[PDB]
Design a protein around this motif. Structure first.
Motif, PDB file in Angstrom:
ATOM      1  N   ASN B  59      -2.613  -4.202   2.180  1.00 42.28           N
ATOM      2  CA  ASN B  59      -2.578  -3.348   0.585  1.00 42.28           C
ATOM      3  C   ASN B  59      -3.274  -1.842   1.517  1.00 42.28           C
ATOM      4  O   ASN B  59      -4.496  -1.992   2.360  1.00 42.28           O
ATOM      5  CB  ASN B  59      -3.101  -3.555  -0.031  1.00 42.28           C
ATOM      6  CG  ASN B  59      -4.473  -3.805  -0.442  1.00 42.28           C
ATOM      7  OD1 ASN B  59      -5.407  -3.641   0.573  1.00 42.28           O
ATOM      8  ND2 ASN B  59      -4.591  -4.287  -1.607  1.00 42.28           N
ATOM      9  N   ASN B  61      -6.251   0.353   0.346  1.00 46.76           N
ATOM     10  CA  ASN B  61      -6.354   0.704  -1.045  1.00 46.76           C
ATOM     11  C   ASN B  61      -8.261   0.765  -0.369  1.00 46.76           C
ATOM     12  O   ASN B  61      -7.868   1.214   0.769  1.00 46.76           O
ATOM     13  CB  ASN B  61      -6.272  -0.599  -1.583  1.00 46.76           C
ATOM     14  CG  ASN B  61      -7.523  -2.016  -1.701  1.00 46.76           C
ATOM     15  OD1 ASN B  61      -7.813  -2.453  -0.007  1.00 46.76           O
ATOM     16  ND2 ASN B  61      -7.087  -2.639  -2.112  1.00 46.76           N
ATOM     17  N   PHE B  63     -10.662  -0.961  -0.158  1.00 50.18           N
ATOM     18  CA  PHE B  63     -11.537  -2.428  -0.164  1.00 50.18           C
ATOM     19  C   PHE B  63     -10.874  -3.390   0.827  1.00 50.18           C
ATOM     20  O   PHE B  63      -9.849  -3.302   1.184  1.00 50.18           O
ATOM     21  CB  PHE B  63     -11.100  -3.876  -1.911  1.00 50.18           C
ATOM     22  CG  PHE B  63     -12.147  -3.665  -2.693  1.00 50.18           C
ATOM     23  CD1 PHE B  63     -13.470  -2.284  -2.699  1.00 50.18           C
ATOM     24  CD2 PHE B  63     -11.904  -4.106  -4.112  1.00 50.18           C
ATOM     25  CE1 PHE B  63     -13.935  -1.267  -3.847  1.00 50.18           C
ATOM     26  CE2 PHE B  63     -12.912  -3.874  -5.196  1.00 50.18           C
ATOM     27  CZ  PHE B  63     -13.525  -2.331  -5.436  1.00 50.18           C
ATOM     28  N   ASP B  67      -7.453  -7.717   0.328  1.00 47.68           N
ATOM     29  CA  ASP B  67      -5.904  -7.124   0.906  1.00 47.68           C
ATOM     30  C   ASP B  67      -5.700  -8.779   1.684  1.00 47.68           C
ATOM     31  O   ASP B  67      -5.152  -8.154   2.749  1.00 47.68           O
ATOM     32  CB  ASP B  67      -6.326  -6.521   1.828  1.00 47.68           C
ATOM     33  CG  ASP B  67      -7.452  -6.714   3.263  1.00 47.68           C
ATOM     34  OD1 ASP B  67      -8.081  -7.487   3.181  1.00 47.68           O
ATOM     35  OD2 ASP B  67      -7.658  -5.643   4.013  1.00 47.68           O
TER      36      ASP B  67
END
Ligand SMILES: *[C@@H]1O[C@H](CO)[C@@H](O)[C@H](O)[C@H]1NC(C)=O
Ligand SMILES: [Ca+2]
Lengths: 59, 82
Positions: B59, B61, B63, B67
């Protein structure tokens, strides 16, 4: 023990249907259930599959 | 299956070569791919898919630990079965 009878060579393992087979198409017997050699398999929360005879579960 | 020449620009996908290395741009669809001479896939992708695209590059994101969200959606500890 070291018994006597009808076996087949070590590369071959026994199938239910009288022939013996390599461990490529050797099914799994998870919870009794006879899964075919490739059966990806999961409820919502677990994750499981049958690779070569053994039943690889995770969570 | 029909081998085409190069460059090539159909359907909003310019298929070019930049700096002696091959490029595939999709700016309408928000991505830019490329490859080098050795073979090293690279994918530049906009901020529009932040917390969207879930796949093998994980992903988009902030973080980096979370993921691994499988095709079911499952945080896994193994980078392999994922
Ligand atoms: C990403 O989207 C998911 C699903 O809607 C949501 O549960 C989560 O809070 C979002 N995370 C971020 C960082 O926005
Ligand atoms: Ca990430």
């Amino acid at each position: 023990a070291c018994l006597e009878g009808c076996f087949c060579p070590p590369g071959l393992y026994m199938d239910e249907r009288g022939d013996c087979v390599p461990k490529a198409q050797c099914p799994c017997y998870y919870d009794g259930e006879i899964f075919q050699p490739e059966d990806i398999f999961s409820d919502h929360h677990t994750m499981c599959y049958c690779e070569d005879g053994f039943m690889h579960c995770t969570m | 299956d029909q081998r085409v020449s190069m460059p090539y620009a159909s359907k909003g996908l310019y298929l070019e070569t930049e700096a002696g290395y091959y490029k595939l741009s999709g700016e309408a669809y928000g991505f830019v791919a490329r490859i080098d001479g050795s073979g090293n896939f690279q994918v530049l992708l906009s901020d529009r898919y932040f917390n969207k695209t879930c796949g093998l590059c994980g992903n988009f994101n902030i973080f980096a630990e979370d993921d691994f969200m499988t095709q079911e959606g499952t945080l896994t500890s193994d980078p392999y079965d994922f």
